[PDB]
């Protein structure tokens, strides 16, 4: 658990530092320096928007790959004694990849809303552009993380389904319903991302 120890140490140190820093800023009357407004505002909307698109695609692909390996290991292991698994349970892989297809679709939809400003002063950048960056970032987070979780869930369920099919052929047809239910979550994330970026306009 060396790497987990390192991560836990970093987390604890960072958040102890944050606690003491917040106590200092509040108590020493230096709160006006902790300008979250200035952070969110000076930080360019392009950073948020492009991080959002990148996350939308990358996390969707991460979930698709996670599920694909989770279920393909089981498919190939079971098929050593019952090769029909390879031909039948490719549907789990298909779902895990539909996750990434949703990811790219939403990356396209988000990227279609990008446009330069030609301004640097926040009053010039305006609510429209700032909210556009924030909402593209949020939509990317939504789609990417929902797709990641849906892909992992479908992969786990598909590994289970492949293992169960390796022993009795008539079970996969009934266990695919769990895969469908797990797939619905990616669709929900896509719908929410689309709603978020519905009225988004950079320029």
């Amino acid at each position: 658990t060396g790497l987990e120890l390192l991560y836990l140490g970093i987390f604890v140190a960072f958040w102890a530092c944050m606690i003491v820093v917040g106590i200092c800023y509040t108590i020493f009357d230096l709160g006006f320096r902790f300008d979250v407004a200035w952070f969110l505002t000076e930080t360019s909307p392009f950073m948020w928007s492009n991080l959002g698109i990148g996350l939308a695609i990358s996390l969707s692909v991460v979930g698709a790959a996670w599920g694909i390996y989770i279920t393909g290991s089981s498919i190939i292991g079971g098929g050593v004694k019952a090769p029909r698994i390879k031909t039948k349970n490719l549907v789990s892989i298909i779902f895990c990849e539909a996750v990434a297809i949703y990811g790219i679709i939403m990356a396209i939809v988000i990227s279609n809303m990008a446009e330069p400003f030609s301004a640097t002063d926040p009053k010039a950048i305006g609510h429209r552009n700032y909210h556009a960056g924030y909402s593209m970032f949020g939509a990317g987070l939504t789609v990417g993380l929902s797709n990641l979780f849906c892909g992992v869930c479908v992969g786990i369920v598909g590994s289970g389904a492949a293992l169960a099919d390796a022993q009795n052929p008539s079970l996969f047809v009934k266990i695919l319903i769990v895969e469908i239910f797990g797939s619905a979550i990616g669709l929900f994330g896509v719908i929410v991302a689309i709603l978020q970026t519905s009225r988004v306009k950079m320029g």
Partner: protein, 49 residues
């Protein structure tokens, strides 16, 4: 209807990979002023093929 976008995905990927291969391999053998480049195009095109 979403997954049929893999047609466009794979087509664009093939086109871009071919373009980058061309521009990184045989552009080297073609973008040479000296006539001695005709000999280099030999090996550069072997690699391209």
């Amino acid at each position: 209807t979403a997954s049929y976008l893999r047609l466009w995905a794979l087509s664009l990927a093939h086109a871009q990979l071919s373009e980058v291969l061309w521009t990184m391999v045989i552009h080297i053998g073609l973008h040479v002023r000296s006539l001695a480049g005709g000999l280099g195009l030999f090996f550069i095109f072997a690699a391209f093929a």
